[PDB]
Amino acid sequence: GEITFDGIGGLTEQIRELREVIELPLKNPEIFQRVGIKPPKGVLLYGPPGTGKTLLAKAVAATIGANFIFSPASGIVDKYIGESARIIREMFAYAKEHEPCIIFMDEVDAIGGRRFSEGTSADREIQRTLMELLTQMDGFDNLGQTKIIMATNRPDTLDPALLRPGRLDRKVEIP
Amino acid sequence: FVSNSEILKPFEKKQEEEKKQLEEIRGNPLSIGTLEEIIDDDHAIVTSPTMPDYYVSILSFVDKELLEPGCSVLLHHKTMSIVGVLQDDADPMVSVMKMDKSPTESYSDIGGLESQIQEIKESVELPLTHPELYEEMGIKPPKGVILYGAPGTGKTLLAKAVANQTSATFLRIVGSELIQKYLGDGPRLCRQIFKVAGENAPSIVFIDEIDAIGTKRYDSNSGGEREIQRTMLELLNQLDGFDDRGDVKVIMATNKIETLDPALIRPGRIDRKILFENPDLSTKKKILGIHTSKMNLSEDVNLETLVTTKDDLSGADIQAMCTEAGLLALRERRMQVTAEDFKQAKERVMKNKVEENLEGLY
Amino acid sequence: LRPGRIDRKIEFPPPSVAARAEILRIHSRKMNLTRGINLRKVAEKMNGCSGADVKGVCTEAGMYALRERRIHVTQEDFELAVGKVMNKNQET
Amino acid sequence: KRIQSVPLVIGQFLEPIDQNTGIVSSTTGMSYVVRILSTLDRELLKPSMSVALHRHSNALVDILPPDSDSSISVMGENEKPDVTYADVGGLDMQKQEIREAVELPLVQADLYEQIGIDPPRGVLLYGPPGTGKTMLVKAVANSTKAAFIRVNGSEFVHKYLGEGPRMVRDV
Amino acid sequence: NDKVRFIKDELRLLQEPGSYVGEVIKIVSDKKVLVKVQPEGKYIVDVAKDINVKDLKASQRVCLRSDSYMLHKVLENKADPLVSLMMVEKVPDSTYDMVGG
């Protein structure tokens, strides 16, 4: 971003809390070696969208000095023969090349509803394409560089699997 | 044949040559497309899973009546222009529809109900084979009939015997599957049934036990479930909005149609009321006596013994008492049934389906 | 339910001492056991298993023989599958 | 056989007809009946393995070897896994089936014949992933140390004609 | 002499992309035949001089030309698998004693 530090910020405890799991692997990842744990990627944002929430990506991640790739949910829809999550798989090639890479999912409640009735039409593929996104948090890919940030409007029926304390860690409320 | 010499001479000469002209416009792919719309300039619209793109113009061999909006036609081999038309037959791809069969039915087992039997025959069977009396009088006869009560007791079995007495095409459509959890499937399939079958005059559609549709209460459209109230709204178009010449006939036999009735019946499209009636001493003799016409049993047992004192046993109750007592006697391989199986079959039928409200005196 | 649409509704006998040997007298054909296996006596030590669960108890008996890696299954391995199967039925 | 040569078009087997005469399904969805070359080995055919065809003539080229494996479905093995099976305990009561339902039928196949019960062929596991459900899956490669294929089908099947059938067979 | 000649015959016979196989729903009196292609729609085609319309059974696998789509000869018969999921079983694994009571 072209913007200076947080204009939506001012909370010292919560904002700096996110930078501890970010800048640690960027320089010396020697703290997690003695502890013997995988570096946490978990970041969760719940509250009103766009207010102290959305702009944290263009502000905090802009001063880290890392690659910031905006990932819209309306650009990955691909209404005709959806490639969907297979597009995102090609994006992680920059993470293996450029280590300082940050990925930000912007205000996605669309994949949240799990549809317990399962009477959907075009949304049955959405729960299907979401499972490929879970593979990046599950399978062969282990980095600690790319950060996992997903935002939502309300703690409704949202998929509990992606809410795992390993997948999502820091939960920043908007009080 | 006689004309094979004189008249056939200036015939086959142009009969074989035009077939060669057909082979020029046909070939042998004979691609089967779909005609969406007829154009006065003789041009068509191609349809195919390969997504064809064609300006093809309508050729000869077809007319305005044969060409139909959305039925398959034959195409040219190279230019893919329309040539022929596909002939429809067998079972269409719409919902379940019976075609034809001749049942063996008459008035036998339901004998004794003739009070209400001759009533339904006046508005159904009579205005079919004798299309008259409406020119001199001028009053339109009713469309269908509505029966409410216990089915299979001889009230619905009456409708089964009328189907054969029509000596024409009879249709039976299922009214259950419309209640599917999907929204909007009800009004669709129902309209295509009466629209395609409008060519054949006799229909007489029968439906059994609809307990779902008909939720209205104080207003016309409430905030209730949409799987129900909107499905009924299609029946208003058939009985009121769009009316035929008297070909289509809708018959519904359910338990209690009371709350269901005045969203549909309308004042005078369909006038019928038939309810289950407790048979008297005369009706019970004709129901049970005729069932024994082909039955054989002990000559020392009277069939009217249990008719004097009995509680609400209709033709459906007797159908089991004949079968239950028959299977017990058939175990010994005998065509006659003893007296002990008569009372034994009546108890288990009366002790199961037959239960009163324990309302005395009054 | 109508007199002659549905004639009779047949009720099956509940499980008992003699009903627990139901599958034991049949499934034991294709399953390897010994001659010290009393189908009626071992059934007295079981509970709530007649048609479906006896097939599961005999299935669990094969898993216990995999630890000993032998070709036979005796009455000692049966008691291990009596309580394990009932623990899943008592849930919920 | 050399008239075919470099323009290989990958086909699929369908069903035999006659000696040196048969139909060969194509990856485009258009089945072609071509004369089978007499040099080709006719005992290696299966309704799985892909074959080779031609661009213009679309004639069967060569029966492909076991190296016919296509990486479009990501065909590979596991190289030096991480999660260890012995470190995660507490499920050992339910985890008794690790070597019994996997390594046991592949080593000793005569134990199931000396028992008489069907082996644990079909395996289904339902529950939240990452909680130790999937952690046990990655632990299988450690106890095994052999060819291991882990591929998550979700959108892995194509949304358009013909790349789905690629994943349906040869895998 | 019938081997090397068959080798050279593979050059001319393979010049075409191949042949098509479909099911025959019915026949006509025009010396044509209706064949339903699996990937495509229904097509009425012409047979050859080695087969007539009386010997063509409904739903049979035949051979069809590439460009002309002409029916050459009958290759195989109706496919073995029926419909999609067929659970119909005659004389099942349970004969006398399986489930007691």
Instruction: Please give the sequence-ordered ranges of beta strands (E in DSSP) within E3-100, or none if there are none.
Output: 22-27, 32-37, 42-46, 62-64, 71-74
What are the backbone dihedrals phi and psi of residue A25, each rounded to the nearest 5 degrees, phi first?
-70, -15
In order of A64, A81, A147, D74, D144, the CA distances from A91 in angstroms are 20, 19, 13, 18, 33
Q: Kindly state the tokens that stand for D114.
A: 């000396």
**Residues in chain D within 8 Å Cβ distance of A160:** 128
Helix, strand or coil, per DSSP, at residue E36:
strand
**Residues in chain D within 8 Å Cβ distance of C62:** 112, 115-117
**Residues in chain C within 8 Å Cβ distance of D115:** 31-32, 62, 65, 73
Radius of gyration of chain D (CA): 22
Helix, strand or coil, per DSSP, at residue C53:
helix
Do the annotations mark residue B292 as ligand-binding?
no
Judge contact between D51 and D12, C-beta under 8 A: yes
* Record: contact C7-B353, CB cut-off 8 A: no
Residue A159 CB-density burial (10 A; 0-12 exposed, 13-18 middle, 19+ buried): middle
Q: Which helix (H) or strand (E) holds C67?
A: helix C53-68
> Checking DSSP bridges between strand B82-85 and strand A148-152, what pairing results, if any?
unpaired
| φ/ψ bin of D130: left (φ > 0), alpha (ψ from -120 to 50), beta (otherwise) | left
* Record: contact E101-C26, CB cut-off 8 A: no
Pick from B122, B133, B138, B234: which is nearest to B178 by CA?
Answer: B234
Judge contact between B160 and B104, C-beta under 8 A: no
Return the DSSP state at C91.
-
Strand order in the sheet with D9-18: D32-34, D21-26, D9-18, D50-53
In order of A164, D12, D54, E51, the CA distances from D35 in angstroms are 58, 15, 13, 22
Q: Cα E72 vs. chain centroid, distance in angstroms? A: 11
E97 Cβ under 8 Å from any chain C Cβ: yes
Interface residue of A129, A135, A143, A158 to substitute, partner D, most D CBs within 10 Å: A135
Do the annotations mark residue B50 as ligand-binding?
no
Please tell me the distance from the alpha carbon of residue B344 to that of residue B348, in angstroms, as a whole number: 7
Write down how long chain A is. Answer: 175
**Residues in chain B within 8 Å Cβ distance of C4:** 316, 319-320, 323
**Residues in chain E within 8 Å Cβ distance of D30:** 18, 20, 39
* Record: contact B48-E32, CB cut-off 8 A: no
Please tell me the distance from the alpha carbon of residue B30 to that of residue B68, in angstroms, as a whole number: 18
Instruction: Convert D67-108 into a string of H (helix), E (strand) and C (coil).
Output: HHCCHHHCCCCCCCCCCCCCCCCCCCCCCCHHHHHHHHHHHC
Return the DSSP state at A65.
T
Mention every residue, 6+ apart, whose C-beta is less than 8 A from residue B304.
Answer: B285
Please tell me the distance from the alpha carbon of residue E32 to that of residue B29, in angstroms, as a whole number: 10
C14 Cβ under 8 Å from any chain B Cβ: no
Q: Residue D34: closest CA among chain E residues belongs to which residue?
A: E18
Which residues are bridge partners to A102 per DSSP? A68
Residue D95 CB-density burial (10 A; 0-12 exposed, 13-18 middle, 19+ buried): middle
Amino acid identity of B21?
A: Q
Q: Residue E46: closest CA among chain B residues belongs to which residue?
A: B28
Judge contact between E59 and B19, C-beta under 8 A: no
Which residues are bridge partners to D15 per DSSP? D23
* Record: contact C2-B352, CB cut-off 8 A: no
Judge contact between B83 and B75, C-beta under 8 A: yes
Q: Which helix (H) or strand (E) holds B306?
A: helix B305-308
Q: Which helix (H) or strand (E) holds A42?
A: strand A42-46
Helix, strand or coil, per DSSP, at residue E20:
strand
E43 Cβ under 8 Å from any chain B Cβ: yes
Helices (H), chain A: 12-20, 23-26, 31-35, 56-63, 85-91, 93-97, 124-136
B 18-57 near E (Cβ less than 8 A)? 27-33, 48-50
A38 Cβ under 8 Å from any chain D Cβ: no
Binding residues of D: 127-134
Among all chains, which residue has been given the structure tokens 């948090």?
A: A137
Please tell me the distance from the alpha carbon of residue A149 to that of residue A66, in angstroms, as a whole number: 15
Judge contact between C61 and C84, C-beta under 8 A: no
* Record: contact C26-E100, CB cut-off 8 A: yes
Helix, strand or coil, per DSSP, at residue E37:
strand
B168 half-sphere exposure, CB direction, 13 A CA radius: 17
* Record: contact C12-E101, CB cut-off 8 A: yes
Q: Tally Cβ neighbours within 10 Å of residue B69.
A: 10
Among all chains, which residue has been given the structure tokens 């549809």?
A: A115
> Checking DSSP bridges between strand D32-34 and strand E62-64, what pairing results, if any?
unpaired
Q: Kindly state the tokens that stand for D62.
A: 């060569």
Which residues are bridge partners to B73 per DSSP? B33, B85
Please tell me the distance from the alpha carbon of residue B300 to that of residue D67, in angstroms, as a whole number: 89
Please tell me the distance from the alpha carbon of residue A146 to that of residue B197, in angstroms, as a whole number: 65
Q: Kindly state the tokens that stand for D2.
A: 């050399």
Please tell me the distance from the alpha carbon of residue B347 to that of residue E15, in angstroms, as a whole number: 83
Mention every residue, 6+ apart, whose C-beta is less than 8 A from residue D117.
Answer: C31, C58, C59, C62
Write down how long chain E is. Answer: 101
Interface residue of B291, B353, B354, B355 to substitute, partner C, most C CBs within 10 Å: B353
A37 Cβ under 8 Å from any chain D Cβ: no
Q: Residue B77: closest CA among chain E residues belongs to which residue?
A: E68
Judge contact between B38 and B67, C-beta under 8 A: yes
Q: Cα A31 vs. chain centroid, distance in angstroms? A: 23
Rounded to the nearest 10 degrees, what angle do helices A12-20 and A56-63 cross at?
A: 60
Please tell me the distance from the alpha carbon of residue C61 to that of residue C31, in angstroms, as a whole number: 10
Return the DSSP state at B175.
S
The three-point CA angle E35-E38-E43 to 5° equals: 30
Do the annotations mark residue B29 as ligand-binding?
no
Please tell me the distance from the alpha carbon of residue A62 to that of residue A9, in angstroms, as a whole number: 14
**Residues in chain E within 8 Å Cβ distance of B28:** 32, 44-46, 68-70
Please tell me the distance from the alpha carbon of residue C45 to that of residue C36, in angstroms, as a whole number: 15
Question: Chains with 3 or more CB pairs closer than 8 angstroms to D?
Answer: A, C, E
| CA of D34 vs chain E CAs: smallest distance (Å) | 6
**Residues in chain B within 8 Å Cβ distance of E70:** 28
Mention every residue, 6+ apart, whose C-beta is less than 8 A from residue B227.
Answer: B179, B180, B181, B182, B183
**Residues in chain C within 8 Å Cβ distance of B349:** 3
C22 Cβ under 8 Å from any chain E Cβ: yes
Judge contact between D99 and C66, C-beta under 8 A: no
Q: Kindly state the tokens that stand for A60.
A: 């905090």
Pick from B218, B302, B304, B208: which is nearest to B257 by CA?
Answer: B208
Please tell me the distance from the alpha carbon of residue B324 to that of residue B351, in angstroms, as a whole number: 14
| CA of B295 vs chain C CAs: smallest distance (Å) | 17
C83 Cβ under 8 Å from any chain E Cβ: no
Helix, strand or coil, per DSSP, at residue A166:
coil
* Record: contact A129-D154, CB cut-off 8 A: yes
What is the rounded end-to-end Cα distance, in angstroms, of chain B? 86
* Record: contact B50-E40, CB cut-off 8 A: yes
Q: Kindly state the tokens that stand for A105.
A: 């999912």
What is the rounded end-to-end Cα distance, in angstroms, of chain D? 28
**Residues in chain A within 8 Å Cβ distance of D131:** 164
Write down how long chain C is. Answer: 92
- One-character DSSP codes across B241-274: IS--SS---EEEEES--TTTGGGTSTTTTS----
What are the backbone dihedrals phi and psi of residue D68, each rounded to the nearest 5 degrees, phi first?
-60, -5
Judged by 3 or more CB pairs under 8 A, whether E touches D is yes
Radius of gyration of chain C (CA): 16
B255 Cβ under 8 Å from any chain C Cβ: no
Q: Which helix (H) or strand (E) holds E7?
A: helix E4-13
- One-character DSSP codes across B64-126: TTT--TT-EEEE-SSS--EEEEPPP-S--SSS-----------SSTTTT-HHHHHHHHHHTTH
The three-point CA angle D147-D151-D157 to 5° equals: 140
Q: Kindly state the tokens that stand for D80.
A: 């030096």
What are the backbone dihedrals phi and psi of residue A58, each rounded to the nearest 5 degrees, phi first?
-75, -5
Q: Which helix (H) or strand (E) holds A102?
A: strand A101-105
| CA of D141 vs chain A CAs: smallest distance (Å) | 13
* Record: contact E40-B32, CB cut-off 8 A: no
E39 Cβ under 8 Å from any chain C Cβ: no
* Record: contact C13-E101, CB cut-off 8 A: yes
Please tell me the distance from the alpha carbon of residue B48 to that of residue B31, in angstroms, as a whole number: 9
Judge contact between B268 and B142, C-beta under 8 A: yes
The three-point CA angle A68-A72-A77 to 5° equals: 140
Which approach determined this entry?
cryo-EM
Amino acid identity of A64?
A: I
**Residues in chain E within 8 Å Cβ distance of D20:** 6
What is the rounded end-to-end Cα distance, in angstroms, of chain A? 25
- One-character DSSP codes across B30-69: -BEEE-----TTSB-----TT-----PBP-SS--TTT--T
C-alpha dihedral (B147, B151, B152, B157), degrees to nearest 10: 10
**Residues in chain A within 8 Å Cβ distance of D129:** 134, 138, 161
Q: Cα B58 vs. chain centroid, distance in angstroms? A: 39
Among all chains, which residue has been given the structure tokens 């849930």?
A: C91
Please tell me the distance from the alpha carbon of residue C2 to that of residue A100, in angstroms, as a whole number: 75
In order of A117, A127, A141, the CA distances from D128 in angstroms are 19, 15, 19
For chain B, after which residues does the C atom lie more than 2.5 Å from the next written residue's N, i.e. where is it broken?
none
Q: Cα E32 vs. chain centroid, distance in angstroms? A: 16
Question: Chains with 3 or more CB pairs closer than 8 angstroms to A?
Answer: D
Return the DSSP state at E32.
E
Helix, strand or coil, per DSSP, at residue E25:
strand
In order of A92, B241, E33, the CA distances from D79 in angstroms are 20, 72, 58
